[PDB]
Amino acid sequence: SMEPTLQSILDQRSLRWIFVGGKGGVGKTTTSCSLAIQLAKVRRSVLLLSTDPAHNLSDAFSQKFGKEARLVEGFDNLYAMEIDPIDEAMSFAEVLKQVNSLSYETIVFDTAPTGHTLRFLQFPTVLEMEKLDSLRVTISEVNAQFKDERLTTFVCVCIPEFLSLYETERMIQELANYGIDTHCIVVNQLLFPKPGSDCEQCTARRRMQKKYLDQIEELYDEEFNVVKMPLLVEEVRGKERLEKFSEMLIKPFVP
Amino acid sequence: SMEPTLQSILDQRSLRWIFVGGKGGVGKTTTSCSLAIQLAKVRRSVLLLSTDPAHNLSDAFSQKFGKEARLVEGFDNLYAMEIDPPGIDEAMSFAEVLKQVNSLSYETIVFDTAPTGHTLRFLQFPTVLDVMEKLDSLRVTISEVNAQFKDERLTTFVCVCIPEFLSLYETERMIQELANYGIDTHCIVVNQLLFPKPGSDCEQCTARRRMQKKYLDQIEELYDEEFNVVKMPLLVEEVRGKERLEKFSEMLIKPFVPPE
Ligand SMILES: Nc1ncnc2c1ncn2[C@@H]1O[C@H](COP(=O)(O)OP(=O)(O)NP(=O)(O)O)[C@@H](O)[C@H]1O
Ligand SMILES: Nc1ncnc2c1ncn2[C@@H]1O[C@H](COP(=O)(O)OP(=O)(O)NP(=O)(O)O)[C@@H](O)[C@H]1O
Ligand SMILES: [Mg+2]
Ligand SMILES: [Mg+2]
Ligand SMILES: [Zn+2]
């Protein structure tokens, strides 16, 4: 079994690209933000890069971000930018190459649901004058980068409902097929009733989620770090609340 | 103020295209489904059309759907399909789907479509926009689509959201977009509302209704008078299968109101 924390992401310093994925709503951003805050604590510098056509990076930190990286207020180490990339993904590849030439030690990508993620992958494995070679080559490289387990992983985020877990299975399975490494699941928005507190809803709710949780661990227990974030009463926004939240990523919540 | 229900949608018999929109996860499918079930009850027939590259329609009903319409098991009136339409042609394709579909005999279509980003881009498209005979035959069918989106007898959007910051904010943006494009919208469905049980004192439960209520209050203060603001409660189990989805949909048309 495996420590239910992202300590390993912190420890694996070769990591250059960390992708965060999951169904809509599960808390992809909240996590990306959290994760980068934690990494930024033990790296030379960290870039938080969001591709949502709209961007919730700024909304997350109540600070205007842009296609121009900048320092996240309250950190001197963390930066964030918000951009907009059979060929809606050539442009996407270029960003990476260019961005990979920047001096940020680690990059945490926040991205539009597997739809476009999964579509990018679909790409290398589909393509199969020197401006033909030259492009492809450039994918070749990127692609190797993705499959290089020292350089790239995926973090899966989900909640304990049917559709979310299902998609998490498919995703884990795709990444495998593509040979992209993944070894972390973040199960978010867990309702932990308060102890000695009897609530029908509260109880029954934990009852149903727990039936998912159980399954998640029985299945990924041994080759995934399965973190478990609690559902908070307020949204997780602003430097403060995100930092607190993020601690739970690294050292397990257990009430 | 306006009745907190989707009765008007049922009563608005010219409606041909009903789009269900909102942030990821808010319950767009669960609503689309619910809504269609209700309409199907008071229309000749109703098509439930999902474009999510996701197969969430089948998941919703535990039944295999596809690019070929079929009867939803347990109804004799309701059908569903699941298809896959710069990002030009594709918006171009999206229009072909709309046109193709529109010429079938289904009295009403409820579109389950993706987060704001994905329909929008397309909407943004018209204004901005022996073979050439097709180049043309295209602009033409885009004219017709865009015409129809703009005819309020024919099209409306339903906005789904939950009572958290990002969701409401997007709902605002959408309502505002639809206005700019002159597409009609007059229903908000506020989903996953925690109503604590009466007499039940719970820290979490209480506090949580506290924070949501501060959103709701705002939602009504703002859209109260020109939107039907429905309020679906958060249920303990996922809403799946014909049965559960039916019960849920009832609340779309009769306001849920459990003692405060
Ligand atoms: N565990 C939690 N407890 C309380 N609030 C949370 C939790 N996780 C996320 N949130 C809040 O719930 C909403 C969704 O989180 P968010 O990270 O935006 O999900 P997401 O996957 O980024 N959404 P999307 O970009 O549409 O796929 C935001 O308001 C968050 O601040
Ligand atoms: N009011 C509710 N009570 C209980 N469960 C709900 C409620 N609304 C939605 N759900 C469950 O929430 C999950 C997601 O709802 P769904 O209709 O899939 O959201 P969505 O907006 O379509 N997600 P996406 O298409 O990825 O943006 C499903 O498990 C539903 O059963
Ligand atoms: Mg996000
Ligand atoms: Mg859906
Ligand atoms: Zn409770």
Side-chain angles (χ1 to χ4, degrees), chain B:
Chain B
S1 186
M2 297 215 259
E3 245 79 279
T5 90
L6 303 186
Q7 180 63 48
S8 34
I9 299 306
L10 309 168
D11 283 341
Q12 176 159 358
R13 253 129 185 296
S14 312
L15 286 173
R16 190 79 205 276
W17 289 352
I18 304 172
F19 287 94
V20 186
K23 270 221 103 175
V26 300
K28 278 175 316 297
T29 291
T30 291
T31 311
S32 306
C33 290
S34 289
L35 187 39
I37 293 180
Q38 220 57 49
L39 278 166
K41 198 175 268 187
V42 295
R43 311 268 154 149
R44 173 179 58 258
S45 68
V46 176
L47 168 66
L48 190 65
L49 195 191
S50 156
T51 278
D52 142 83
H55 268 306
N56 288 166
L57 269 181
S58 329
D59 294 321
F61 274 114
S62 313
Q63 178 188 170
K64 228 281 100 83
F65 303 129
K67 67 89 67 78
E68 199 97 278
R70 49 203 86 148
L71 208 62
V72 184
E73 257 292 329
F75 304 81
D76 50 40
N77 203 204
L78 178 67
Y79 300 84
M81 77 184 317
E82 279 171 353
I83 31 169
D84 285 330
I88 290 82
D89 41 31
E90 321 141 7
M92 205 34 235
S93 294
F94 176 64
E96 285 300 339
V97 179
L98 280 174
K99 172 108 160 223
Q100 179 23 228
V101 155
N102 196 80
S103 74
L104 286 36
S105 98
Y106 304 117
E107 186 173 7
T108 309
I109 310 183
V110 176
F111 299 80
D112 198 10
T113 49
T116 330
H118 268 258
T119 332
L120 189 36
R121 216 202 340 100
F122 160 164
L123 293 270
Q124 270 220 203
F125 189 60
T127 106
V128 193
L129 199 188
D130 54 78
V131 308
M132 60 263 74
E133 165 191 355
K134 226 148 337 201
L135 222 57
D136 188 318
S137 80
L138 226 52
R139 179 26 218 256
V140 156
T141 109
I142 277 175
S143 267
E144 295 173 350
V145 171
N146 158 96
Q148 251 231 202
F149 264 97
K150 302 187 62 167
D151 192 341
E152 74 192 84
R153 327 178 187 107
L154 292 188
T155 308
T156 352
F157 275 58
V158 175
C159 305
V160 188
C161 67
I162 62 182
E164 62 101 20
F165 177 54
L166 285 176
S167 168
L168 309 203
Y169 201 121
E170 207 213 54
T171 297
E172 293 206 322
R173 145 178 320 117
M174 217 197 289
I175 291 181
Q176 169 71 10
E177 287 298 340
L178 293 172
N180 293 357
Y181 287 122
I183 299 166
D184 176 73
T185 191
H186 73 79
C187 296
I188 298 171
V189 173
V190 185
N191 188 28
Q192 306 176 28
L193 295 167
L194 204 271
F195 303 84
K197 280 194 165 192
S200 297
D201 69 32
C202 200
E203 322 264 9
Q204 286 197 57
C205 262
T206 291
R208 223 198 254 173
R209 211 261 168 326
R210 218 183 266 110
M211 86 106 207
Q212 318 210 299
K213 216 256 193 327
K214 147 225 157 158
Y215 285 133
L216 251 182
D217 282 2
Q218 306 198 334
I219 309 212
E220 345 226 75
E221 222 268 310
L222 248 168
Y223 300 120
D224 222 18
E225 303 196 39
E226 63 236 339
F227 291 83
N228 308 350
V229 182
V230 195
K231 280 134 249 172
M232 310 303 279
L234 177 62
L235 277 22
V236 274
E237 300 238 336
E238 291 102 0
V239 174
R240 295 171 71 203
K242 165 168 181 275
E243 224 200 45
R244 305 191 45 122
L245 288 157
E246 283 207 286
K247 293 192 201 205
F248 193 64
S249 66
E250 297 300 347
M251 274 173 299
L252 238 30
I253 301 314
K254 283 108 177 240
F256 179 83
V257 297
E260 36 78 57

Side-chain angles (χ1 to χ4, degrees), chain A residues 23-25 53-54 56 59 88 116 119 160-163 166 191-194 199-202 204-205 208 211-212 231-235 237, chain B residues 23-25 53-54 56 59 86-87 90 118 163-166 169 173 194-197 202-205 207-208 211 215 234 236-238 240:
Chain A
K23 271 220 100 169
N56 295 155
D59 293 321
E88 272 46 66
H116 297 271
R119 216 157 304 166
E161 64 93 27
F162 178 54
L163 280 175
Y166 207 118
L191 195 277
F192 301 84
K194 282 192 165 199
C199 213
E200 281 139 10
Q201 288 197 63
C202 264
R205 214 142 156 209
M208 86 104 203
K211 148 222 153 169
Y212 285 135
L231 173 64
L232 281 23
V233 274
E234 301 238 336
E235 298 102 351
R237 296 174 71 202
Chain B
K23 270 221 103 175
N56 288 166
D59 294 321
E90 321 141 7
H118 268 258
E164 62 101 20
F165 177 54
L166 285 176
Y169 201 121
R173 145 178 320 117
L194 204 271
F195 303 84
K197 280 194 165 192
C202 200
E203 322 264 9
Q204 286 197 57
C205 262
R208 223 198 254 173
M211 86 106 207
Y215 285 133
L234 177 62
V236 274
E237 300 238 336
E238 291 102 0
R240 295 171 71 203

Side-chain angles (χ1 to χ4, degrees), chain A residues 2-251:
Chain A
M2 296 216 259
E3 252 68 294
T5 99
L6 300 187
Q7 185 56 54
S8 36
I9 299 298
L10 269 22
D11 286 347
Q12 176 168 0
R13 279 166 168 268
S14 325
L15 292 176
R16 193 77 206 287
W17 294 349
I18 303 178
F19 289 96
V20 186
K23 271 220 100 169
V26 303
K28 278 181 309 295
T29 284
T30 290
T31 314
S32 317
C33 289
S34 285
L35 184 43
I37 292 177
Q38 219 57 49
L39 275 169
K41 201 167 275 175
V42 298
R43 308 271 156 154
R44 171 178 61 255
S45 67
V46 175
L47 170 62
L48 188 64
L49 193 191
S50 160
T51 288
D52 152 31
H55 308 270
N56 295 155
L57 233 17
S58 318
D59 293 321
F61 270 111
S62 307
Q63 175 185 170
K64 166 94 278 167
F65 298 134
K67 67 89 65 76
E68 200 103 281
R70 51 205 79 158
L71 214 63
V72 185
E73 259 286 332
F75 304 80
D76 41 56
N77 201 202
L78 185 64
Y79 301 86
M81 69 185 315
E82 281 167 358
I83 33 160
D84 287 322
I86 321 99
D87 196 50
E88 272 46 66
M90 148 42 201
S91 300
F92 176 33
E94 262 311 312
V95 28
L96 276 170
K97 208 190 76 45
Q98 102 187 56
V99 132
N100 203 1
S101 88
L102 289 317
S103 23
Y104 297 113
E105 194 168 5
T106 312
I107 306 188
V108 178
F109 301 79
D110 189 22
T111 351
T114 333
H116 297 271
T117 271
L118 217 326
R119 216 157 304 166
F120 184 83
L121 323 172
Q122 314 274 283
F123 218 45
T125 76
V126 155
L127 294 73
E128 302 139 344
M129 297 102 308
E130 342 80 55
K131 48 164 211 67
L132 315 152
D133 208 69
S134 91
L135 179 27
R136 141 269 148 74
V137 141
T138 203
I139 305 199
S140 279
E141 303 170 357
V142 142
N143 197 105
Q145 234 261 30
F146 266 115
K147 310 173 74 156
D148 185 350
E149 96 209 83
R150 332 172 185 110
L151 299 185
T152 307
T153 354
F154 269 61
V155 174
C156 302
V157 187
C158 65
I159 54 168
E161 64 93 27
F162 178 54
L163 280 175
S164 177
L165 311 204
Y166 207 118
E167 208 213 58
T168 293
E169 296 199 320
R170 152 176 318 116
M171 222 193 289
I172 287 174
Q173 168 73 8
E174 291 294 344
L175 293 177
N177 291 359
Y178 285 127
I180 296 163
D181 178 84
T182 186
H183 73 82
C184 309
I185 293 162
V186 172
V187 185
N188 190 24
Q189 304 181 27
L190 293 170
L191 195 277
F192 301 84
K194 282 192 165 199
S197 302
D198 67 27
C199 213
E200 281 139 10
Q201 288 197 63
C202 264
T203 294
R205 214 142 156 209
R206 213 251 167 328
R207 219 183 267 108
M208 86 104 203
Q209 317 208 304
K210 216 258 190 325
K211 148 222 153 169
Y212 285 135
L213 248 180
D214 284 0
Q215 310 197 323
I216 310 213
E217 341 228 80
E218 220 272 314
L219 250 170
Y220 299 120
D221 227 22
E222 305 204 38
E223 59 233 344
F224 289 88
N225 305 2
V226 179
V227 195
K228 278 133 254 169
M229 313 303 283
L231 173 64
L232 281 23
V233 274
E234 301 238 336
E235 298 102 351
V236 170
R237 296 174 71 202
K239 171 170 166 280
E240 254 189 15
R241 303 191 39 117
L242 287 155
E243 279 206 288
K244 291 194 194 211
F245 197 64
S246 75
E247 300 295 358
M248 271 167 307
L249 239 30
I250 296 315
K251 96 312 141 161

